[PDB]
Structure 1
Amino acid sequence: VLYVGSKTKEGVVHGVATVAEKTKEQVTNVGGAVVTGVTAVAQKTVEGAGSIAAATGFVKK
């Protein structure tokens, strides 16, 4: 068996330029979940769940 991994790329982010001009930014949360403003995020998972911008209100039993 011969695996040759040359310059491979998995879960990669490069060359990102952003500008944000906001006068007012407000977030109100009451017993939930809120995710805002996620930029230039990379990951790699092996034998597991991969979530990036995940939000769940609640879990009950």
Structure 2
Amino acid sequence: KTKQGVAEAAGKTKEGVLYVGSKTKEGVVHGVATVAEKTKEQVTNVGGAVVTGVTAVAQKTVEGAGSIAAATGFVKKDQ
């Protein structure tokens, strides 16, 4: 047997109130807040990559090798 990333909860009672709960989070992006007020942005681009936004990426994979989650704002000119 093998357990990985497992949340387990067990409870037992006779009389009263019983609460049992389990939660799991794998590859989760939570709570991203961004505010821009009275911001001046001037961009001149000639054949390049410019990124000034908000990016939130969450990736979960099983048995995956060589995977890329996020590749933002790049110039790739391989031969």
Aligned length: 61
When Rg is computed on C-alpha atoms for both structures, the one with the higher figure is 2
Q: Which range moves more in the overlay, 2-11 or 43-52?
A: 2-11
Q: Distance in 2 between matches of 1:4 and 1:50?
A: 39
Partner residue, 2:75: 59
- For structure 2, the residue ranges without an aligned partner over 5 or more in a row are 1-16
Query: Relative to structure 1, is the Cα distance of residues 38 and 58 closer, same or farther in structure 2, using a 3 angstrom cutoff?
Result: closer
Partner residue, 2:10: none
Q: Contact between 1:13 and 1:40, CA under 8 Å: does it hold in 2?
A: yes
Q: CA RMSD in A?
A: 6.7
Kindly indicate whether structure 1 or structure 2 has the higher relative contact order, using CA contacts under 8 Å at least 6 residues apart: 1
Q: Distance in 2 between matches of 1:44 and 1:28?
A: 36
- Identical counterparts, % of pairs: 100
- For structure 1, the residue ranges without an aligned partner over 5 or more in a row are none
- Return the TM-score normalized by structure 2: 0.39
